Amino acid sequence: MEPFRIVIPQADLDDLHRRLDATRWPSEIPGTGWSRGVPLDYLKELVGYWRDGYDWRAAEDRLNTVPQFTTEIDGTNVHFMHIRSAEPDALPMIITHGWPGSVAEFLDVIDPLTNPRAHGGDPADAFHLVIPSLPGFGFSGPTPEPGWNLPRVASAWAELMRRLGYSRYAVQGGDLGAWTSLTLSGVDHEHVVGTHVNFLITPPSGDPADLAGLGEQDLARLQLLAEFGAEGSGYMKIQSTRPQTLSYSLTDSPVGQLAWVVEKFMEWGDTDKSPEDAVDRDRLLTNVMIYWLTATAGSSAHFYYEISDVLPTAPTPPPPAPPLPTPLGVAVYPADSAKPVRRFAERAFPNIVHWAELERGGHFAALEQPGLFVSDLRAFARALRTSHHH
Amino acid sequence: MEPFRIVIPQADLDDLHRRLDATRWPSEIPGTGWSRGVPLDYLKELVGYWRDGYDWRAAEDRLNTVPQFTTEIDGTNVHFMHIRSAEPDALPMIITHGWPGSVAEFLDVIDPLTNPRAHGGDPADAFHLVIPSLPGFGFSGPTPEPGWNLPRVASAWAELMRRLGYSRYAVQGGDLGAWTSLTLSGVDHEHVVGTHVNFLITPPSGDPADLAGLGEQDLARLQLLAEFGAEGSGYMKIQSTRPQTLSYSLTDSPVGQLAWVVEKFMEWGDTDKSPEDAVDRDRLLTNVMIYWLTATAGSSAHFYYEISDVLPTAPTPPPPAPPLPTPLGVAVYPADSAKPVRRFAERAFPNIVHWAELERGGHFAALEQPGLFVSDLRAFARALRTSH
Ligand SMILES: O[C@@H]1Cc2ccccc2[C@H]1O
Ligand SMILES: O[C@@H]1Cc2ccccc2[C@H]1O
């Protein structure tokens, strides 16, 4: 438990610009748009801005306005932001990012969540926030040994909240952070008072009977899963099997690191022509910079290998889980890469206290739609309070 | 159709050495060996040799001892080696490499196949060789448009053989070259006299009854397929879906390009502790240099996208093909990444005339075991002459 500040040596930035200037670009097949990955023309334009335009020092300053700390847990370094609320009886909540994200995703929602009185919110709806970097990611950095899977991350987090003195807290996440949050609600069930996910997958049974009566939208959600498996799972299959092989090119090549990550902001964000439709280029590059500067493309990929058996890329599906009794909030963003079927969600989670279908935004909710994210999490906190005393 | 010679600008070599010198290495998780991909200590040592000891000019010299040509077919550049036998009666054969291989794989089998008299062979077993670079690969280079799938590549080859004046020829391949050869045997059935593959997958139906009576060795071969899908197919899934995203890092980073390729030489070769157990490092780096210097990591990856529908990684597993009538030779190398169950192969190919189970070697047969490969192909020629 020691204070932490991001201080990037100028030498690292000079090296980055050296590499950018020396980029060797591939050929392309014309007329294929985004269908086979990041198009050449777009990436050239974004790289030009990255090299001459993007301001890391300002991003660095902004990140450093948030209190950060590091601490060692279960043999590994855990970096985390901790922002105390301006209001007494605030709900402690630990928010977890996923891949290819980072703690930078949450910069625009931290102040409205923790200080609602200064952002037109109700003081009754305040949060204390703990926002940790996943082991292997960003400023937490590489893990030293095998075995950092969902329950090991969850146990680390429970220990983090214990050290911080939160005996009662909620958990929140999207992407892999949602899976970690759901896992933690079981692992630390004595201390977790509620769970909110903005990403939820509900696979079908495989029995054509459980589809009876489902409407067009729910059937389309199931189709989205199948499409993801067929077409969108490439990154997941390679990171879950040979993350180290992949890591050499992503650690050596900043354009390669950028393409690898920015593709997902295009495909999973609420976009039309460009990833910048949903996330502006400074935020896009700041997130990529956290991967690049900490050189965590590979260590973050190893997470997928550790949890390969519970991914959709698993050979055989994991056995059906017993119901998770955690009071649950679900937020469904319309451009997300996967969306839950409520009938199926009701079976797996008997205590849903909050369900919202939002009007806009994709996979990176806090970053894409901070206003909606904040309003939704407040309504979840209100629903939690309501469900506990009635 | 014009003569071709490899002449790499010095500036490209200077650029490569600058990149190698400036390599930024990743973290590792110690003690995981090769289980999660190419280990850090090994690759640092290989890159050291690449930078300090490897001699591209000598490799370039050896490649250029092979007569090579380029020609435009169906809108794309096609590079190929063409080596005539001194025996006029020789069997013409087109040999196709796969991924992450190249025409450099066959340097040690060319003279024995085309001049058997000087290399322990019978003049009756001579070949004329045509050894093309796949469209999108090596010195053929990037294709200009969508659609270069197996039938389109096969058609291009039939056209190449027609242009060379070969109205009767055999086809040979491993990896994707075997799939291309099998496709070509159907596409140009009039002119293909026989097909030899040193790579063949035989998927089970999924009906438990079809496994009845199979010995433990054949059951293990089927399980090899399952293991490949589960753990070995990462490169195939990303190249078949987002090859262009992948291409940026592989085209910009020589250590990345090296890791991406050399992993398969470890996993698919007859290896123990190192890929150099099966293929020495000069040959390994020469093959990688062909990808690096032609900047074809991306365009070679696009081939997988074009054929995604027939891969193991397909959205829906491809329906079992009807039987193919081509006279077929099959060579099974014991360390290969996949190996056929003969009972199943003979249902898919009712005219198998040659079946060899070799006792050494993996996926890169001509490169790993040139002696075994030459003997087997000569045996195949003899099987074709005495059965048809
Ligand atoms: O968008 C992706 C869809 C999916 C499915 C399972 C786990 C994670 C994820 C996301 O990364
Ligand atoms: O790339 C090859 C294609 C394939 C198909 C089945 C098993 C292994 C393999 C690979 O060795």
Automatic annotation (TrEMBL), chain A:
Q: Where is the Epoxide hydrolase N-terminal domain?
A: 1-106
Tell me the domain of life. Bacteria
Please provide, alphabetically and separated by semicolons, the GO molecular function terms listed in this UniProt record: epoxide hydrolase activity
Q: List UniProt keywords, sorted A-Z.
A: Aromatic hydrocarbons catabolism, Hydrolase
Biological process terms from the Gene Ontology for this record are: epoxide metabolic process
Pfam families per UniProt: EHN
The catalytic site is made up of: 175 (nucleophile), 304 (proton donor), 363 (proton acceptor)
- Give the record's family classification: Belongs to the peptidase S33 family.
Mind telling me what this protein is named? Epoxide hydrolase
